[model samples]
Target: QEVTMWGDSHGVAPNQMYRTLVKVALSESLPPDAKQIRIGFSLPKETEEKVTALYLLVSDSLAVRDLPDYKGRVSYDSFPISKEDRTTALSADSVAGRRFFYLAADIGPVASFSRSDTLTARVEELAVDGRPLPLKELSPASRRLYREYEALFVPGDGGSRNYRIPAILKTANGTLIAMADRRKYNQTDLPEDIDIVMRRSTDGGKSWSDPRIIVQGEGRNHGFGDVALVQTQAGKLLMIFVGGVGLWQSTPDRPQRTYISGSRDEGLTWSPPRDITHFIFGKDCADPGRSRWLASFCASGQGLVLPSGRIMFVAAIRESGQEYVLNNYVLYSDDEGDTWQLSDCAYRRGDEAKLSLMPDGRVLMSIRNQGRQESRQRFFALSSDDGLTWERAKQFEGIHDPGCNGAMLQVKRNGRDQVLHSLPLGPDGRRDGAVYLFDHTSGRWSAPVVVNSGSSAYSDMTLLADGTIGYFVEEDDEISLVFIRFVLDDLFD
Candidate 1:
């Protein structure tokens, strides 16, 4: 896993340093006498500090030479001479090999104080035993090094015209299910034909199944989109989709309606959509819905299941116009997905909100402020009652976006809960898909690592098996979808 030099980080003071490390997974075989491989790292000038040291099998097998400020610098390292140190015997017939590469440099003297320097490691033609391996006579490991870049969900074959609003979930069965708004017509969000379509990757996102209609939709007015997903403590996969009401531009005349579909067979087949709107907002409110009030709709992205076995998600409550133009609230099911309940209101002006539970059992919510109200930044709320109620909403100081829906998760990293937030990396328009890392032991959120530099929009993140981040994003101005893979090292490095 190669973690790119992403965001600016304020390392330990007095001697600020920036570093990056990439783990390479060797394939099914190895090269002959693969004792050396030259790594090319590009960097800035040698003004304040030259490269401190570099290591491979041992220390300063590591060396550094001077170079121009902003040029590609190539460094060399060696492997072990004996077979006992380089490999382990599996049996008489086969063996396993291990190789390690460690690097160091002094990225000192901040020029811009924030973002000035950059570094990237790449290639040198499969060098071996301190000699470059020839392409023709080299072992099976030759021609084996190259940077990885490819698309996950590109254009459609006959499935749909456009796909938007990607939300991913890694199920208990290890199936990587990705959900999106599969627009049958065009890229229009609302007032068009869209289905809550999904794709499943049973093998860690290496391949995916054809689009499965989680909540099938018809054309023009009636559609099933604005979806969120959650895994129940009982091991069932629950998909919550905001559904259309009657005609075009519809809303639940009663409490807003959300549909649920489940999969017990590890998402190989899905149940039909069932109306559970009343179960959530149907109980208690200021008015309407046999028992509840105005209107309600769940936001896109995955909801969370608490340790107490209660499943919770944030949904917008519409007192009037549309679901996107309303306040926010928490929806929860304490006894699994059988029934649901609503929590206290979130903010005066909130559109789409996400839930992140801290390590101390405090639920931290981040909401799209809609930029109404004086808080021109992203907002947050805290709930101690397993999302049954929320305190008054406040602005998350470290995050800001242009009233767009994104994703957030509190993951257990380094034995503490860390926050991972992804969205377009600016105060406005959709571009620059970014990821920000927050160390619970450190201060607030670090600067965001821009993952995609193209037309980035709605996105979601799922934790892969190897601690790599599996990101599903709607990119290219809603014309395509992208699945990006990166490690936490990319952000902190």
Candidate 2:
């Protein structure tokens, strides 16, 4: 079985139409006797509901004929394909010879909400001029291709709304885990607590498990916020979340502080709420600034456990004297949380930072300038000797940040190192996000590949064992995770 999928949205009718024209132009550019031709189409999945619809379409396309009309009939006998006995074989065969289309519609309310509601449609080719197309061009699209729709969702308010956040990970068994945040928020004067749910995929993110509550709490003041997860060398899983304590904090008696919790058994159960601030900074200081200056602060974001059993956690912190500066700090634990060493690797007056471990045992740090004067600059730093030292810190080309945090990761493909950064391309203050790949060998970053252009921000990405990339991001208070099939070939010609 072979398939080809194509799709577009109403708001992007003109641009998608133009892209189709470009495909035609490229086809025309090919030699007349060329045996095989290549065409590329991009469609944004505007809504979460569209994922099921797309799966149905793609599954059908790989097995049967194309449906010009949604209500039309599908013929499997017209092609040489046969319905196989195993689901894996069927899926494997169906993915071949099919092209899926997605429509990334940047329409909706609330930048996050508007981006999620966009729809993506997948169209498969049944017969090309009454003949089956070759399978080589029709394997199910790459996970990176499906990543284009990872953040699609409609808000609970019923109005047209969308959110874009991508989450990518890998399980201990080397299975790619891709998920999207499904929990929604209810609007009210009182804090409306919402469940933070996740949908998981085992087979390289091609499909997903049912929604599971990664975090849940009672009352109007409780809910799971932005989350980050990392797997230890001993196969233990650590998940961190940001929880809000609500507006009561403005009152004299109640103060709001971020909370931290962990799961040692691969998210099967989590520890009770532990005041991370007190645990990291001690209880002597009056404020976080003073405490961070006296010691280190363990906040939200990613953490890496080195091969030597040393745990390093990275997060944004504001030291006492540098209250205005938001920088990335490395908190190292030599005795498994018994004690910690705090060090400032990169600090900027007004910039948001994220950190990841490179393939060659180096640390890659990305900083997005949020200060009024330097808001458009995005800087990259490298530390060859862990987080203890740094050099070759330079501004990455084609990335512009306007006050939101961006995430990056290092991936290996074709025996080379590649870096993928997710953020907005222009200097707009709002969230207009994309993912750019940097080729270490070529010393050049590829053109900006648009991810979710709507109100999207705070993207954290991870490379799975199956060579797929998954990311999780915040969308208008709700979090979303997306999976993309990435390949080294996509970075080069």
Candidate 3:
């Protein structure tokens, strides 16, 4: 029959829960005299040192991959086994007529995909009731069956050389708005003619409308990029992007500028860009202490809408000092997008950051590391007063992303809270993109669920109108923008 197995063993880590590593469907029914199911796997050489225990589970149907749905079909389960014992046997009374066999592992708390210690296990031997089943008897069935990614914007499309940075939002009218930087000349940042472009999906990202320029660039020095989006209480789409000089090159005389645009008819049309540059920094800024800051730009992706009707977005602010330094600051507007104000510094040396409202009413900020580090973990801070002041930044051990922008959003389903975080689970550079889930009730993060296991970076996510998770990312070395939508159950058992 068919075998449901892992496509690859790259992002699989133990979260104290048993998860299938590889499974096989027997070609023939179990013999009448069969009494047990024996299975063996070829584990990594360092499995003994890295793994706490392994498991074996047998099922009757090929649906064992979705553990929760196939729980009743599971015939026998070997809860915990040692790495030294490579082989396991389960009673055949419940599995006598079964055809699906699964090999699972529990690496306990010592293993981590962020730490580059992901386990790779494969089924090497299989037998039912002591009857050996050859590998040729099974056919591949799972792993590749999950996520489907479709390219939305590619290089040389819409007259743009390359597209990078994704910002997405779903308007109240059920329109999916996907936005990115249309780098006209090359893949460089601002100071090069980059325009803010967007595509709308009326049917939940299955198909997208043609590229439309929301904010057109005048020339190389007069460009716009880094878009962040949010929907206000009045059901209007609000967008913020930066134009003009580059980050390091920004100066008080002619610093990088911030602009705002709005759309009342969903995402079909947008108003002209309004210069709110001085409101954030420069001599006329609301807070005189921040007037000297050289540059400020929204961390392109999804912004948050607080319960009190406040619109908030995280901006990476550059210091006025000679040496390069970036800090995360919260920018909020009380009366929608009319006026903006800044919050105290959230993180001293932070790069791009994102915010999501937690269940406890405190806003969570996931900050990217300032620069490349030997060990880079995503930094986090909590704000009880919406986006005003944040507690001291602390490293979140659950995420180990290379210095790149990721996405964060918390949603409630079935009376339970789940915080979804998407970033590259890098073995080396930015690759192996996956979404990790944080279960609020359990207070633990689930294993990395692979989105695109290849070269990927810079992503934004939103909850689709149909309750599916919509992901937009820069893929294949920033040459294309891809969109993927998946159900929440796909990440869980």
Candidate 4:
């Protein structure tokens, strides 16, 4: 484990925890007495991190590939396992009769954020005749030129038991403020202790500050699930998130609500929690026809700034006795986030909407089209002016969404503006994660350049100072938080 911290694994949490399985069929075995097969691996980044255990799992499932294309297979169904803490080579005799073997390496302890591995491993394929196949590096399409991809927020970090719905922002001063919901009580959404936490990175995400509570929801066993972050052109950092009074089927008085907080010193600190309900929505009034009170909520990841220095955020209304919120509208401010006002444009049949400013001076509001469509695609509407009005919506057919959270942002290159979106692409599955590029030049969205090939739920993105983009996402199955950074060129083709 070169595991750096002590855990159930017993070995300390060292710098490296790399595992791989090498399979060898009975026919592929060299002399049964063969002792060592030389192999080398390391973290893509350079640091004082030590390579503790260079483990090897030798198995038969992958013992017969002919060439470099990974026609070689490995099975997860309990292969014979072997280990080496620091050695580069492993003995075939370790698993003399088994058809498969597993290898684990303990990369020694890494002290800081830069110590974590990016997990881009290339295994050398050996031919059936024992000759090594031609080794080829990453193709131009999957390669980054001057920058490296790294993770900013990883699951099981921050003494954080779990995390959810993340947001990030790059201040004008180049400071990075990342928001995360630290779920301390077993990954349940809320009614348990979930705190909206944050970390600041001054050195381009190579390192991060300790966790800070942007808005503590656990005070009353509540949670601030989504921590949306944005900045104003007139020097203000603003954030919004939701806090549930408790879980559903609770004491009738508590319902979920949206909130706002601000920072003036580049996210150094935040102002107190203010219920933005009174601003975006009209006064809370009793339904003349019902007994229980009705209310509205501001969707998470709702804030965006326009080039004209106007700030806009979106919200949905829950009318009295209504089971679903069927309408959405914009809440905007012109004085750099000091106050806000509501818009009349009605977006029906959507929720969990996020806003992005297009380079052509229109603000596009993208919504999570919940299940009504024959094909689940993201629904978005455009506002030619400020948030006061809206135009008809166009479904983004290229972006496949399974009724989950997604975000979009604009990137500028060579003075031309282009659009980039992040989401779990489908075959309607969360496992095939994506960072899609919408090229204005081509006026078409490219096939997603996949980011994670595993199950992920909610996501958000921010433009890096360099030419890279950082995406924060939640994995559904394991419930982990992940950050994937990639360059624009890789998607532009």
Candidate 5:
């Protein structure tokens, strides 16, 4: 008797330059006489030269598993082809039954795709030991593409092992400044030799300057990351980030410290990081209760410019050394970035959150669910007093998420207010990244527009100089910082 098997299809749109197209798993052992396994796939036209090759990997566990999990067990093979031969095949011999097989492709570094456009690499044939096996009918071996974007930071860029947490700002001079955590050791958060680095694009985002270290990490004892930035009213760039220890491991004796920096030269150079951890909520805090807080860090991304000329960022605070719960608080600076103060708690049980100044002169906050075990939707709060105090956090009725930090941007469209929110829509993990539009006129959120259909995580957005929505995101199985831009009209049908 012959056993049947089929592979599941998946890939990210606009090709992060690399994507896994399919994965097949064998639940049962192969026949004793089996000798060879041949697989074939048809490449889409968009992949002509843009995509260099479609490769395969055979393993007992899924290679799509998080980077650290599949260390020594993955092995693969690949062959190149052209437009003339859209179909190709490869075979493996010597017969032990491999439980998993993955087919992936690599797109050229310079290549990109348009929104709704698709690139499909379909499996056309599969055979084992001379017996033909057919792929199951499934969602097309297709990836829904988004507009062309650039990888500002990728693994091995600047000798770093990984990069995550994107924060961006558009300078008054029309320059674009991009920032992220250059995870030197791995993709984990701070207390792990992470540094906050940046790049600037003089001509919008078409070209960027080399990475510049805003704050370099000395070692695991004093690493820095999770940057939240704002361009002050006087055109100086102000940044807030954390250092010293990991969030969960933080304690009053040694907490994740907060630091602020400024760049007056269009991000060409930055002032040395100034420690303000005590000002926010530390042993010296005015509120005696908050002095015992274990950890606190501003949500990494764009901070807000309040109506009263104050700079505000939502800081996630962990109460004590014993409890692991995190609450949200507002951090504001009145004397430019010189001095800071903390607000009353915004949300008692929040993770990372973003704040947007609404058109009605109120402040709106979109917060991440504390944990996956809770609601799948984001939490929201409103502040009428410029973020000093917030109403009770309310569960957002829209936008499905898996408890990941989201990006929020409020803009004027046709003389009306609209909000753009981006988050992962995947059912279980981080994937299917999209942007949602909230029209204040209708009091509704437009269905999200898919931006990345593959492994997607933390993101940030700002209005570009050219009137497009400038988006910076984390995507690909091997995560990298990607930047893409689109118009307001693109979010609607």
Candidate 6:
């Protein structure tokens, strides 16, 4: 069955809470007869001291990994986790047996002392419910090699803070790959140069492989970042990303342009950078900005690749109009990035919209309405005839989004079309975020069932081959990837 994943962190040791939620969620997904869930975590091994302990929270199975030794420090009152608290299980048996699970890890405390070092931490998982899962561990030597692939961030000295967050994806083969941008942004540095790095996971997400310098450029703002990848019709992996000058609106010596890079060998190797944006602009359209600023566009969301090899890239465009306003636009390439065409605006004056292709060849655009004056509604638009034109948009009644980006997926369950959208609820505390099923035959959106509570900004949904629904989310600095078996009956029951 396909499962859903949700990840996030909070508090001083947010990474710990991040992994804790992962373990709890995975354990809750297992059947009653399952044995034990083997959960693993990976962060910068150099900062291992920050990660306190790794534990598996299950109804009948209680196994801990890498538990920290507080020793006599508990008596000093300075230790973060006391000896008594170190072994305590955060959830009870009744909580673990339920279908919904939330696990967390305490990655030490953030120190206020000036002499102490603050580090970026993370947690990962390997096996679940005693299944012999694919788990990879980063060796000390490999860690050194991968350092070059680390996302560079301008040190947030005591004055300003900057860091790189990793984007992770699990493949059909159960391998997880983590990606991040390698450019650092410093206040003193010029803005027109940056780059990105990629890491691999042989196991689910227990450990990562050596970092590979996938994209490169000079200065602090001259590289490719925010990459989204999907398998193409030719069985090759195509990566679409925003490349160009810096994010600060500085005009670099060379103009910023989007680029496309592909790999025939399943992402093992990629071709040199190719400026597909310029090719698509054509001679008549000398400047891509005439339609939209190709360089300043944020291409962080998913892309669609039709069966005919056409590529459709959807991104949120920030137009510096009278005031800085954001909207969503679609970039279409009929010949696989060799040429480009811009569709009419999808969402005007809104931010963070996602697109999914339905089985009927209609493109579904889901957007987070930034203009809260209209009750903060979630916008949906349908584009028939292949994204060339879109029908008038409609807002889902009774649904008030928190102006945060979300994801939509097309699933076939019990021989019916199921559309699932993930977004935060309104300020009144309705349903924070949920997966709503749309009955194509009825042309009605079902009542949404809460997926995760609290404030969640970004989320992605994908249906696995086994029918399990997967969800990954970013709430503030915390990131969680969760999997849950989705049952159609649950929507009614």
lDDT of each: 0.59, 0.45, 0.74, 0.57, 0.74, 0.49
What number of clashing residue pairs does each candidate have, in the order they appear?
2, 48, 1, 27, 0, 48
Candidate 6's residue-wise lDDT over 333-418, tens digit each? 77756677777877776666567778888888776676573766677788887776676456333466766656677877678886
lDDT of 2 by residue, 297-350 (tens): 233345667776666666555444334455566656566544455555565553
Per-candidate Cα RMSD to the true structure, in Å, reads 14.3, 13.7, 13.8, 9.9, 5.5, 15.7
Off by over 4 Å in 1: 1-150, 245-256, 281-292, 321-325, 372-375, 392-396, 412-416
lDDT of 5 at 10: 34
Model 6: lDDT equals: 0.49
lDDT of 4 by residue, 173-283 (tens): 889877777786567765567888888878876557876876766554566776677798877898876677542322224556657788899998898977754454333
Error of 3 at 200 (Å): 0.7
lDDT of 5 by residue, 193-243 (tens): 988889988876767888887788999968899998899998888888999
What C-alpha lDDT, on a 0 to 100 scale, does residue 42 get in candidate 5? 70
For candidate 1, lDDT tens digit of each residue in 212-232? 776767765567788788889
- Which of the two, 1 or 3, has more TM-score? 3
Runs of candidate 3 exceeding 4 Å displacement: 1-148, 393-396, 413-415
Worst 10 residues of 1 by lDDT: 137-146
| Tens-digit lDDT track of model 3 for 293-344 | 7888889897898889999889888877577888889988999888888888
Best by TM-score: 5
State the displacement of the C-alpha of residue 287, model 4, in Å, after optimal TM-score superposition.
Answer: 12
